[PDB]
Amino acid sequence: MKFESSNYRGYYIRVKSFSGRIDPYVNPVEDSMFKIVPGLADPSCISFESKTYPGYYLKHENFRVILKKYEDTDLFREDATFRVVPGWADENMISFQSYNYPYRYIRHRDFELYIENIKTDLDRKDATFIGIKV
């Protein structure tokens, strides 16, 4: 799957140097592509596996969304697990709630990805995505 930003259309979640951001015209476009597996800490949740780096998952660390090799720890699995919810800015779209930090959501901010509290209208828009099956 791919994930487009809804307020920066044509921008996609991608990994650059093992760090999550949103970019247009992702090159190599495979950096924008993930396998969606059951949540490592909860199968009613989701986890994001790298397509180019199998066994690496998107995960938050110091509230920054990064890519990191799987580790056999509860903290890693929790850091790597997100609940898909109706979009903050648009219920026809999606948002990603952190499993171990329930009041923090994946959002972009100067085109980097974090998990942060969603308080304002711009917060909601920065945290809203369109899943695209590829």
Ligand code: NA
């Ligand atoms: Na903070």
